[PDB]
Amino acid sequence: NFIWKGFINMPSVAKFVTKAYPVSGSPEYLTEDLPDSIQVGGRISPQTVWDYVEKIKASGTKEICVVRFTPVTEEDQISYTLLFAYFSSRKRYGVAANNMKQVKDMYLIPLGATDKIPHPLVPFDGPGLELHRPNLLLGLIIRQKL
């Protein structure tokens, strides 16, 4: 019941195969809307994302969904961890640079195992996350509405 399997690729940092699972919002059509390899093009301050997400919700023109990434093999898990640490240590989110037509924005969020969920994502409208969990990379996906 993963909705997409593909690479995350941050040049000079980490590249790995991952499966995405739904967390919040409708994951419908994500299999067609995500590229084979999500290219991480840069980094962004979390407050900038949350200010933007507030405007997105106010505008009523987009759908927000949240997925969680899991490494596929033990080798993937080493690089997944490097990427988590990259953004966690710098208190940044990642920015996808090769979005497909239906996705306006995609951010990669490190969520520490003992972290509180960022408030603009609560409440989760979907399976959510387990209380007892590893360090995780989430994807925050802004999609166009019909």
């Binding site: 941050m10 040049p11 000079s12 940092v13 290219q39 991480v40 093009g41 840069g42 980094r43 962004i44 900038t48 994302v49 200010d51 933007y52 405007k55 997105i56 505008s59 023109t61 987009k62 940044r92 920015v95 640079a97 306006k104 924005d105």
Partner: peptide, 13 residues
Amino acid sequence: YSPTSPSYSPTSP
């Protein structure tokens, strides 16, 4: 209405 995406800090060489 349609908010413009925020700028960010590019990382990739």
